[PDB]
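Tokens help. Our protein:
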Amino acid sequence: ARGRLKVFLGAAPGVGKTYAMLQAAHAQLRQGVRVMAGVVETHGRAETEALLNGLPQQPLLRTEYRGMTLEEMDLDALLKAAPSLVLVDELAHTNAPGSRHTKRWQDIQELLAAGIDVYTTVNVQHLESLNDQVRGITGVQVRETLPDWVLQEAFDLVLIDLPPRELLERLRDGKVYVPEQARAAIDAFFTQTNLTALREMAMQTAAAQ
């Protein structure tokens, strides 16, 4: 049986992609599926941290790079253990230096070729075809990109939707964490106008699948 990819697609950070993925994963766990978390970003949400702690977890690999402790999915251990389903946040991620592959999507393709199912999350901004539209709207450069075909050839795609106004409240209320984005950049990104634009992109993306 070929590995099947399910992508939880969202307009932006904070729309609930990871939580949706972890709830989907619990349904599978309950039905007896050997589920393993490969890489999951809970981003300080206690409810998401509580879902993750009910799932088997594969320790990450830590490296040091320019003072920073970088974490990657332990691909080699996952291939060896051969779980039935691996959970992998952030489909557009560019891997830590010294990784076998440049991109986390390649890590995923490798699991999938080994017959391992994969659940993943991605924000719409990372799609290659949309890089310039996103930069034109937000004024922020998207540096981690994803070839559109990686998402197009996904077995399953689910849109995780949230109103922009509500996402702005979440950001205000300390519920949205965006690690590799400085304050000036977050302020430039998370506006009503920009989030409305990105929500339409996510929907147009989901409809074209």
Notes: The two ends are 23 Å apart (CA to CA). The first strand starts at residue 5 and ends at 10. The chain has nine helices and seven strands. Strands lie at 5-10, 35-39, 61-65, 68-72, 85-88, 117-123, 156-159.
